[PDB]
Ligand binder design. Structure first.
Ligand SMILES: [Zn+2]
Ligand SMILES: [Zn+2]
Lengths: 87, 86
DNA sequence: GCCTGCAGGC
DNA sequence: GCCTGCAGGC
């Protein structure tokens, strides 16, 4: 993907939130900023807790198109994302 | 503590202790379970379903002797039950 | 228990 | 691409 953001249920409980530094629990809703790596080719996620993600400031107009993995979310979470972005 | 286990193969890496060929992921496989003296916990010796019977393993009552039996799909439950009889 | 293949994190 | 955890084999 070439999108700037990603959302998904945490594939493990091992990722740390770039903002608050705590672990992001398996299966919890997490969002990433996708960044290029200097050490190799490929994009790499910077993960945040859902709430942590929004605190750090974001002008996401249409979550459905800008955020990779939006469609694979449970419906009510797709809403939680829209309501939050629009806020 | 049952002596046998049956399940759909969790991976494709296990090798049949009768014929030596690999046991394909999700295929129906059977094990005799053995206690390890190197660590607490049982080691399974896996077989392709058919190979299991060709080495002299024997089961009268699958339901009770074979761990995992009742989570098999129905037709596989019947296959095991009949093969055991035969 | 040890190994290994690979998924997840970075 | 490097590191590590871990599931799955034995
Ligand atoms: Zn956080
Ligand atoms: Zn075999």
């Amino acid at each position: 993907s070439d999108k700037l953001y990603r959302v998904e249920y945490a594939k493990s409980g091992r990722a740390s939130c770039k903002k608050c530094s705590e672990s992001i629990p398996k299966d919890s809703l997490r969002m990433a900023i996708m960044v290029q790596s200097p050490m190799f080719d490929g994009k790499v996620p910077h993960w945040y807790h859902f709430s942590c993600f929004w605190k750090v400031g974001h002008s996401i107009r249409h979550p459905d198109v800008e955020v990779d993995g939006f469609s694979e979310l449970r419906w009510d979470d797709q809403q939680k994302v829209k309501k939050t972005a629009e806020a």
